[PDB]
Amino acid sequence: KTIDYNPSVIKYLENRIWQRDQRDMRAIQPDAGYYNDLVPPIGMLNNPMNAVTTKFVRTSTNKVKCPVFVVRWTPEGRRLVTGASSGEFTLWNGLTFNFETILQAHDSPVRAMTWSHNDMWMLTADHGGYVKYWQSNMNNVKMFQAHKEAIREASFSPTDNKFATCSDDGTVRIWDFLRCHEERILRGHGADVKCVDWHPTKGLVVSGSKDSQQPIKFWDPKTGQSLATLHAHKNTVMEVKLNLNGNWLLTASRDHLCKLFDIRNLKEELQVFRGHKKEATAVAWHPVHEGLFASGGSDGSLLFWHVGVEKEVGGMEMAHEGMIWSLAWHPLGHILCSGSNDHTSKFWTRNRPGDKMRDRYNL
């Protein structure tokens, strides 16, 4: 089995020339004979549903059968690394998903995991509190201890200089990269903080919470000042993410909701996202289609959303067994991954033209 992105890009480069827009494109007609005419995202840029993946590929499971928490792609798309509860990095291949290698990174369940903006470094945390740097060849580089309590989410500045780690003691500590130096601590959050995202331009740190009195706090990295308080949910904001454009704050909480916030206008509120019958705990934005995102659930629900539509575009209810922790799109938006709450990990690619969706999923 395989899902090769190469015949889509070459068909896009041959259509790169004589196509002025997407209003000039010859339409893909729904039959099994029009398989060559698929172009990737970035080609058929409007019509964003495109790439709303609901075709199953493979369930990449380990031998040891440990539940996985964070799964992210290598930024060249060569391989999926997978963080599990036993501190093991299981590197999955990127086209023929079989196997590459198993590392042993931490002595704890691997909580946060992020790659650099360039291909250089990979920040990984754990449930004990240690933060290790990682080269692209998966070599262990210098380590330290960031927090005394389990670190739940990490993310760094719009350059490779400065990261922030949030943990279950309630502190969001902002770190230097090269010196491993604790610059300052962001206190005054109320309880344990479980998500942090840096802004791509402006230099913000947005933190979630379990505390209902102080659910979302905007922070400043340069000062230690809390910029703005934004109580938006009833209980326990799980994930907080930001677009690459920087205008939107997307929030996932335990109260069966996802909410869009404009960070320029915190008084009002953009649209809300119901339909998760259980908690939404893994929100992940789409890299090329700004304004759409995947959303997981704790019953295993996988839902795909789009900004402007009140209902959901399409997704899966009770398909994936267990919870869902985190999702990561490939750098091209064609295939999606997910960390299940059991001991597996499923890969999802777009529906082919002409097929009838009669399997266990979808219909």
């Binding site: 090769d4 398989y35 698929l38 454009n245």
Partner: protein, 1175 residues
């Protein structure tokens, strides 16, 4: 760092077209518009679209419509630009430029709803009744323009209306409907072709009724049940009403009272569409990219994809309803991007790719098509290669500069072609001489063919006899006892008149008729049975043929306030000079121009300041030469050509209401200058072409054909040209005849393989298949072209884990087949541009050529280092479920013994290497004799052995490297998304390294190398219509140490770029990095010093502010980086060219406001035009 961007070829390829009033309400004009350039066409009767006005915009026209305001004498235009800009403009009389009525800036951060990346294009629609106009902004906002003569607009939030529209496939205004009803296609629940089990069909229609005064919007006639894939909607005209909605597979007619009638076209609506659809008999086709319009009522002409044209007839019952549809298969044509009915029986087919042409249709209910004159088009230039011409003559072989011309893969599909483009005309010299001491020359006709060649020495006069053998004449006739000022035919090629300073000798042939003696003479004009003679002191005498043939003296009654400097004569075969009529032109030394009616002698036209160069003239220094001539069909439109202070400036003429009803408009140039000899020499019928040759330090052929388009062609070979004459002989066909500066007379004929009607002289070579790549092979001098073909697909590959299994497609007979592409590699001969027979490499069944370059691998066979092979990387596209693998194909051209009767068959491919690689092959290069191939995420640098490639050194690169180039052991690479990874290959150790990369993500079309003395720039074009130059600067601190690149110059070009050339200078060591834009044109980048740069940056900031640009635009914000942090360092040489267009009364005002003299800037700008005169 510091550069300038110039445009060498204006962009061709039309996107928009209409048929409206432009000049006046009486006649109608075809108004076509391409990438940032507007053309207005008349129509003469064969019928040949004549150009009337061409307009250059500083934007990229995104929509275009025309609505005639009440009270106005013309019809306005509504030009939609990028980032939401509407611009209502009209043609202006008086000044011939087009006036700007209104501007509407609609770019607001609160309108975009948080969406940064703009996908949707703005769309302008106007009413059929002409009540209001509408613009869809950003895909959400509707701007309504009610009908100084305007009314202030108001923006409709569409998601604040009923039914939550949320999209906009198309929107039109309907007919009938006293309120201007706007129909809107949309999808409330958007779905995707390939996902139809969960969303079967969702398209809807809201016909909104616009109240101008009340500003309320009631929804009437909602439908909600249309098929999932609907393309454009078309408003059915007035006696029927309603709307036809093109779907991809079906075709619908919709009306507010009639039940919905819709038929399917091809059997693909089986399990996808639940809308109640019939089965259209006979018809079998798909409407996915179709352009259509209505003949007057009940007939619709549809241009499908594939170029096929159908005529849909709406079968109308007695209730003015629709019963059914009728489809017929008429003639096939160009792959259109537009469609317009012109009057009755004439259709225009505007097309980006392919030649946009004019059709004629007559009845035969059933129609038949006749093709009128097409418009030549250089299409989407995909890859282009710089080659050398073949038949350059041996007289010109010792020129020091390289002699080379470009070959462009243009067009697509059935209109796929090669384009052989070239600058300055290289004449074929058939016979040369050496005639010293004589400088002027004339050819007269003695009894079609030119009889006498007349040379004027300083002391005497040479006469030559033509015929079988050209030979110098010895007998009486012309007086050889002195110089002759000018010799020309009088009458109609019957009687020859020469003029010496002493008298005006007539001549009928070998025998002089009579003699008439007249201050030293300088020039005389003898055109059109009137001979006007002018001496040095300002005296003017006129002659005239008088058949009883003897010329009498009629000195003009003139009251001289100052001395007459120069003269011209002109008459009107197809004339606009109203109030064959003869006209005398006279320029006095005080600075005025005076056009005289010639049989009488009265002042008709008067300009107060004729020198200078004022842009538009109206009635009431040191001019050298002035010539009025007509150019075009039946000598229609006249031109004024003057010579004022080493600066050519030519004027058109256009009609405008006891004086002349004309005014003169100045047109731009690229040409510069640095007894009396005439420099402006009018020629008729040289290779069928009429026009002017302009003598000087840089010669320029001025041509106007029946198109009416002005064509300036230089001639840089063989130095400056002193004199010139048209020449028609026996052994020489219709040709020409000129002196060299070294004193060599050259019998010459234009080369017949080109076509000089286009802005560059171009031979368009039809392939009738898509040209992908082209590569000049320097050894044996041929071109290797990868082409395609469109065959119906019939199999589906599967990967079962053991072997491949093909699945046979088996459907109904009423079913359309998918397109499978089979690529083959041609071999084109430059000698005659026919493809070489028995030389074609045909690839595999599913195989696609991803790259072709001329790769010089190293070999011990030659005495040099390299051989210059042709290497093609190619891989198989069999769907996403099959692993893509590639194959590197190395070919060399070998001269063999030719097949008898076919001299072109001396060349043939020999394949050295053809082996299937481990993965796809995406790009190829060369590095000191090493082939650099990019497979997957690895970039192997192979080495060529005796028969096989052996790998030396690779790295792991990013996602999909598609372009690579390299210069002296440094490779540059180009990703789809990560945009840059420049490499370095050390020689001794077999290792390849990554020097630096662009840390930002960026789309990339292709890359180049900007070359200065020591500064090596990395030019990148980037899908967002931009250009940017990255440099590797380790000592800089804003970059990280030797890892991050930094852009140093940013520039928003209007069009996409795939090709890149480098030519040498003629600027010690800086290469010009040419490029051919994908929307038709060809551009430049010329590096400059900082000192020359900032004198012109102060100029551009003055030229942007103080000049009334077209459509009220900002030339700065258009050339600002992206969309439509920016570090701009590239000048706008299309805006600096409007410094040359200013009069030198007004040129000195901007020079004082920036603080210099005007003569320095003219030295600054004209060195840019001089060094860039290649190709």
């Amino acid at each position: 760092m510091y550069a300038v961007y110039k445009q060498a070829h204006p962009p061709t390829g039309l996107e928009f077209s209409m048929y409206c009033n432009f000049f006046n309400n009486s006649e109608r004009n075809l108004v076509v518009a391409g990438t940032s350039q507007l053309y207005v066409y008349r129509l003469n009767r064969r019928e040949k679209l004549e150009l009337a006005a061409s307009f250059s915009f500083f934007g990229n026209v995104m929509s275009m419509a025309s609505v005639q305001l009440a009270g106005a004498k013309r019809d306005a235009l509504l030009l939609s630009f990028k980032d939401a800009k509407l611009s209502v403009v009209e043609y202006d009389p008086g000044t011939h430029d087009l006036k700007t009525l209104s501007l509407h800036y609609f770019e607001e951060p609160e309108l975009r709803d948080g969406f940064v990346q703009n996908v949707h294009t703005p769309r302008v629609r106007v009413d059929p009744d002409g009540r209001c106009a509408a613009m869809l902004v950003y895909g959400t906002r509707l701007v309504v323009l009610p009908f100084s003569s305007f009314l202030p607009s108001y923006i409709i939030d569409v998601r604040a209306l009923d039914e939550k529209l949320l999209n906009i496939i198309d929107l039109q205004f309907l007919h009938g409907y006293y309120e201007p009803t706007l129909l809107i296609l949309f999808e409330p629940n958007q779905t995707w072709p390939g996902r139809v089990a969960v969303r079967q069909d969702t398209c809807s229609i809201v016909a909104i009724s616009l109240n101008i005064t009340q500003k309320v919007h009631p929804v009437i006639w909602s439908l909600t049940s249309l098929p999932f894939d609907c393309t454009q909607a078309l408003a059915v005209p007035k006696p029927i009403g309603g709307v036809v909605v093109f779907a991809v597979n079906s075709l619908l007619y919709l009306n507010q009272s009639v039940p919905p009638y819709g038929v399917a076209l091809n059997s693909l609506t089986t399990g996808t569409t639940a809308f109640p659809l019939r089965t259209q008999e006979g018809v079998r086709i798909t409407l996915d990219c179709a352009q259509a319009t209505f003949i007057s009522y009940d007939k619709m002409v549809i241009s499908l994809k594939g170029g096929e044209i159908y005529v849909l007839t709406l079968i109308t019952d007695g209730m003015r309803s629709v019963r059914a549809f009728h489809f017929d298969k008429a003639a096939a044509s160009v792959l259109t991007t537009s469609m317009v009915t012109m009057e009755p029986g004439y259709l225009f087919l505007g097309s980006r790719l392919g030649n946009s042409l004019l059709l004629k249709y007559t009845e035969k209910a059933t129609y038949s098509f006749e093709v009128c004159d097409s418009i030549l088009n250089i299409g989407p230039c995909a890859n282009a290669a710089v080659g050398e011409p073949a038949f350059l003559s041996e007289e010109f072989q010792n020129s020091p500069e390289p002699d080379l011309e470009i070959v462009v893969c243009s067009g697509h599909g059935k209109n796929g072609a090669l384009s052989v483009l070239q600058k300055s005309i290289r004449p074929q010299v058939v016979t040369t001489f050496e005639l010293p001491g004589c400088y002027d020359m004339w050819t007269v006709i003695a009894p079609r063919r030119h009889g006498f060649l007349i040379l004027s020495r300083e002391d005497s006069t040479m006469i030559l006899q033509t015929g079988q053998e050209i030979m110098e004449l010895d007998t009486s006739g012309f007086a050889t006892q002195g110089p002759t000022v000018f010799a020309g035919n009088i009458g109609d090629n019957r009687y020859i008149v020469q003029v010496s300073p002493l008298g005006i000798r007539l001549l009928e042939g070998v025998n002089q008729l009579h003699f008439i003696p007249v201050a030293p003479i300088v020039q005389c004009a003898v055109a059109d049975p009137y001979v006007v003679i002018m001496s040095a002191e300002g005296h003017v005498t006129m002659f005239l043929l008088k058949s009883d043939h003897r010329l009498a003296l009629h000195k003009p009654p003139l009251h001289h306030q100052s001395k007459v400097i120069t003269l011209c004569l002109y008459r009107d075969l197809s004339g606009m000079f109203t109030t064959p009529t003869h006209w005398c032109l006279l320029v006095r030394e005080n600075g005025t121009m005076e056009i005289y009616q010639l049989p009488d002698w009265r002042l008709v036209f008067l300009v107060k300041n004729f020198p200078v160069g004022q842009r538009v003239l109206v009635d009431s220094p040191l001019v050298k030469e002035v010539l009025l001539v007509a150019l075009g069909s039946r000598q229609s439109r006249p031109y004024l050509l003057v010579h004022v202070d080493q600066e050519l400036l030519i004027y058109e003429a256009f009609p405008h209401d006891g004086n002349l009803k004309v005014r003169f408009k100045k047109v731009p140039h690229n040409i510069n200058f640095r007894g009396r000899v005439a420099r402006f020499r009018y020629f008729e019928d040289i290779y069928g072409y009429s026009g002017v040759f302009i003598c000087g330090p840089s010669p320029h052929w001025l041509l106007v054909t029946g198109r009416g388009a002005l064509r300036l062609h230089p001639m840089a070979i063989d130095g400056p040209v002193d004199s010139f004459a048209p020449f028609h002989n026996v052994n020489c066909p219709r040709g020409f005849l000129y002196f060299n500066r070294q004193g060599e007379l050259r019998i010459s004929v234009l080369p017949a393989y080109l076509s000089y009607d286009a802005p560059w002289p171009v031979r368009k070579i039809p392939l009738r298949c898509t040209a992908h790549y082209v590569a000049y092979h320097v050894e044996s001098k041929v071109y290797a072209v990868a082409t395609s073909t469109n065959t119906p697909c019939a199999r589906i590959p599967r990967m079962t884990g053991e072997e491949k299994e093909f699945e046979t497609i088996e459907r109904d007979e009423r079913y359309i087949h998918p397109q499978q592409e089979a690529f083959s590699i041609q071999l084109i001969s430059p000698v005659s541009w026919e493809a070489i027979p028995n030389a074609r490499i045909e690839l595999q069944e599913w195989e696609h050529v991803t790259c072709m370059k001329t790769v010089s691998l190293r070999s011990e066979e030659t005495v040099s280092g390299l051989k210059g092979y042709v290497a093609a990387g190619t891989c198989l596209m069999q769907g996403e479920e099959v692993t893509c693998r590639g194959r590197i194909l190395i070919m060399d051209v070998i001269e063999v013994v030719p097949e008898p009767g076919q001299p072109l068959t001396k060349n043939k491919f020999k394949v050295l290497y053809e082996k299937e690689q481990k993965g796809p092959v995406t790009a190829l290069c060369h590095c000191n004799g090493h082939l650099v191939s990019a497979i997957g995420q690895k970039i192997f640098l192979w080495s060529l052995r005796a028969s096989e490639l052996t790998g030396m050194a690779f790295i792991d690169t990013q996602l999909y490297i598609h372009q690579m180039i390299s210069v002296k052991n440094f490779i540059l690479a180009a990703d789809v998304m990560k945009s840059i990874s420049l490499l370095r290959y050390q020689e001794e150790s077999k290792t390849l390294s990554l020097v630096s990369r662009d840390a930002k993500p960026l789309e990339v079309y292709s890359v180049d190398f900007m070359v200065d003395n020591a500064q090596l720039g990395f030019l990148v074009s980037d899908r967002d219509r931009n250009l940017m130059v990255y440099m590797y600067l380790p000592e800089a601190k804003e970059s990280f140490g030797g890892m991050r690149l930094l852009r140093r110059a940013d520039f928003h070009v209007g069009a996409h770029v795939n090709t890149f050339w480098r030519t040498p200078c003629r600027w010690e060591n800086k290469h010009i990095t040419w490029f051919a834009t994908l929307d038709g044109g060809i551009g430049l980048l010329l590096p400059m010093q900082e000192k020359t740069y900032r004198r012109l940056l102060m100029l551009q900031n003055a030229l942007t502010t103080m000049l009334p640009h077209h459509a009220g635009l900002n030339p700065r914000a258009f050339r600002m980086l992206h969309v439509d942090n920016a570090v701009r360092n590239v000048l706008d040489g299309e805006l600096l060219n409007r410094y040359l267009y200013l009069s030198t009364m007004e040129r000195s005002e901007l020079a004082k406001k920036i603080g210099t003299t005007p003569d320095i800037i003219l030295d600054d700008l004209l060195e840019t035009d001089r060094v860039t005169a290649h190709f």
